[PDB]
Amino acid sequence: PQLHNGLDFSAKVIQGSLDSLPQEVRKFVEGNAQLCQPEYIHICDGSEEEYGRLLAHMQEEGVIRKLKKYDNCWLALTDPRDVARIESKTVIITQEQRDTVPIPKSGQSQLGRWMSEEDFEKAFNARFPGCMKGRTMYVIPFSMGPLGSPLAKIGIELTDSPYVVASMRIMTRMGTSVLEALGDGEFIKCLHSVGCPLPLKKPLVNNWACNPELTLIAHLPDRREIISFGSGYGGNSLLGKKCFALRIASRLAKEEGWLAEHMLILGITNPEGKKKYLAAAFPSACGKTNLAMMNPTLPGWKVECVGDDIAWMKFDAQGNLRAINPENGFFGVAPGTSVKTNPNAIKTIQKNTIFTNVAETSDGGVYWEGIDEPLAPGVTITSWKNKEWRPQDEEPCAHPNSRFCTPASQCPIIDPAWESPEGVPIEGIIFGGRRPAGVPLVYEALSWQHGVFVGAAMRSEATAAAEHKGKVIMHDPFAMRPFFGYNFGKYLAHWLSMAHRPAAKLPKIFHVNWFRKDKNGKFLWPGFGENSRVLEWMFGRIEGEDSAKLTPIGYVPKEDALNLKGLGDVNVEELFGISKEFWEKEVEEIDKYLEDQVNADLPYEIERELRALKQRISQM
Ligand SMILES: Nc1nc2c(ncn2[C@@H]2O[C@H](COP(=O)(O)OP(=O)(O)OP(=O)(O)O)[C@@H](O)[C@H]2O)c(=O)[nH]1
Ligand SMILES: O=C(O)C(=O)CS(=O)(=O)O
Ligand SMILES: [Mn+2]
Ligand SMILES: [Mn+2]
Ligand SMILES: [Mn+2]
Structure with missing residues (x-):
């Protein structure tokens, strides 16, 4: 009325x-x-x-331009002050x-x-x-x-x-x-x-x-x-x-x-016909989309993508932790995507894709740093600033946080159960970030409480996702630091409470680091499709293979337990080197962080794991 x-x-x-x-x-x-x-x-x-x-x-x-080289692809250039999240x-x-x-x-x-x-x-x-x-x-x-x-x-x-x-x-x-x-x-x-x-x-x-x-x-x-x-x-x-x-x-x-996490969901199948699903929580701009759409280099292995960013997880009546992808497409970073790094993404973004702040070629195509693809003679490049760009300028032709927006059903390796309302059973959870030194390539948690401590103690050098700059190792627990919806101490207690549920089938918890460098500033691990060798060891550990070695920080693969054939130049000593001097400073930074930020809401089980890790390191 x-x-x-x-x-x-x-x-x-x-x-x-x-x-x-x-x-x-x-x-x-x-x-x-x-x-x-x-x-x-x-x-x-x-x-x-x-x-x-x-x-x-x-x-x-x-507002948008039509990319005439592809089928229904559009380019949008934004204000340079409105290019990312504002945490x-x-x-x-x-x-x-x-x-x-x-x-x-x-x-x-x-x-x-x-x-x-x-x-x-x-x-x-x-x-x-x-x-x-x-x-x-x-x-x-x-x-x-x-x-x-x-x-x-x-x-x-x-x-x-x-x-x-x-x-x-x-x-x-x-x-x-x-x-x-x-x-x-x-x-x-x-x-x-x-x-x-x-x-x-x-x-x-x-x-x-x-x-x-x-x-x-x-x-x-x-x-x-x-x-x-x-x-x-x-x-x-x-x-x-x-x-x-x-x-x-x-x-x-x-x-x-239930659980709402900043995780990808991928299904992996081995040459023996067994398929498992894994979830991985990496910080922003740290490799989630590349891992979820990986083209594995090991023969007989196949990776299928359920989601690349957000996972909603909940136990079922049988005790299985089931996960769904609540999204309908992929909003992934464009720079660095090439046929070598992520070939499955190239096949996806060639139609019905909206690009934002990437460079446009004169023939109607897209271009960005790390595309690893030469252009035809006479083809000019227009940067994301709507200006003529040559490889002699200092500024890049595409913004570091430029994105593509493509439907998920167009992905050639999309998992056939990505729209299933019942979800997929998760048997493994992966943590990790960008650590140039100290952290080995992969290790496995000792228990569920230690695994929750591993996720809470995540650190990674600052990227170009939020608005941080400089080479600074910052804390990003569970890769959820900019996305927490309530008290983080209650968040940890919610994760620890999962071990109290009857008939619960807790997944294994791993921590990876694709970004460990040597003394020359060069990456020690090739990464991308070669990370299938790391996922192979995880697959066997979930099945119960005896291929693990006990360390003060967790279980690492045994000698000759990783398929390193074809990469005969990898330095295994530096990939898994555990320095006591590094880990004495590392636990000090975790202690000072958890004591100040969580304070009286810190669950005791997390403090007990901090005590246990510091003791095992002192005995080295
Ligand atoms: N060295 C190395 N770099 C990688 C690897 N995988 C991805 N990267 C780089 O890390 C960057 C992160 O890419 P994404 O996978 O889209 O990052 P993300 O985790 O999905 O972050 P958001 O999309 O913001 O949630 C890419 O630009 C790659 O260049 C890897 O296995 N090894
Ligand atoms: O920040 C992230 O992890 C993203 O996925 C990009 S945005 O959707 O937050 O802009
Ligand atoms: Mn008008
Ligand atoms: Mn994200
Ligand atoms: Mn992504």
Whole structure:
């Protein structure tokens, strides 16, 4: 009801009907419509006709270009200030601070950024009132996970960016059918705005609308709401990926008893016809997508991909830890992808793929550093800054965090159970990061408690994913440091509690390091497809083969236990060298980190493993 006509937005709907929306869905749409004041309201249906109209619209607006060399591939160049996640401006709103982060013993919490409701209300009222003036508010109904899976969650994202809508059609399952499955059930509320209401006060760079000064990515897990403003790039705008499927999902997983982790899922088959599934948690820009799509160099071995970034795991009635990929596509880093490193990715991104901030060749193709592919004579390269680029310049032709957005079903080695609603049984979990020194190539945990300690003690040199710089070894426990949704001490206690469940079939826990260098700064391990030799040893350990050797840090492969045939130049002494001087300093850094960041919320079982490791190292 109303006294005038200022609340009924039915006259602004250009596709769909507010009358056909569920009541709680319509309240969420009309409520924010009155606040953001959009010129139009577009209810997405996920059809090919709608996807084609948005591509044509963005091309006419100068947002995206058509890559004429491939089949339905598009290039988008963004503002140089809006190129990655902004971890510093990502906050979690809870009534009590201890719900979000463990109260630090002295320093500042590196495990999350908390903000009170009172402070966020002021930051919200200074950004969103009238932010969509003259723009179209798109309503995106999407489902994370197979539409029908028990662990499937439905979300509604409001946004004023057609680039977000197009990307969400690739990365999630979006359409009219998601609204039918929702009904009057619960959904996650997602609100996004680029923060450029018309008329524009500031001219846009590369026709990319963004507001870097007022960028804010807020999470309210008690309200099931995600509110993002100012950014339209990747993890900031695609609210169903990092904000939903990791931060909010980890909170829900703790409440409901499952797991939401920053892990890939791959299935590997041996020449004897046995197939196992593995999960691996690597930090951002550390090799997850390359591992999940690996072309193995060992004959008779095959790798199939279930997912490359996010995993939702939960025990079943039989005690098996089952995992699903809640995503629908791949949002992977472009630089470094070549026919040598990731040939299965090259086959995937040749059609129906949206590229962001990669270089364009004059014949209509893509180009980036590490592509390992020469060009034809007369072919010129246009950098991501929309400028002419020659190999003589200092700057790279593609941004380090440039991405491709391709459907998962196009991957030639996609696992036939990647859309199965029951999930795949995980028999192994892999941790690791970028360590240039000290950490051996691979080792195996001694128990479930030691394995949880291994994940909590993860460290890796700073990459180019967030906004950190410099060669600095930083802590990244479970590769979840920028994505924790609640107290990290309670996160560890949730992982340790898995060993208390009846009939539980706990997987083995391994730690790898593809990035160990020698004294020359050269990589000691070739990596990429050669990592199948490391996965071969894991496969045998899960079966129970006697190919392990006990060390002060865990189980390492025996002498002549790794298939190193063909790589006769590998320095096995330096690949598995365990220096006591290095590990005395390493445990000191882990002790100082866990004591300050977790403090009174640290489970005793984690402190016991820290004591045990330091004792075994002292006896060396
Ligand atoms: N030396 C070495 N480098 C690798 C290996 N695998 C991947 N890399 C490099 O590490 C970078 C990380 O690539 P990704 O697999 O996309 O990183 P990611 O873990 O998926 O990170 P996100 O996509 O942000 O979640 C790539 O650009 C590769 O160049 C490897 O086995 N050995
Ligand atoms: O940061 C990561 O690990 C990503 O996968 C990229 S984004 O989706 O967070 O932009
Ligand atoms: Mn126009
Ligand atoms: Mn990731
Ligand atoms: Mn990836």
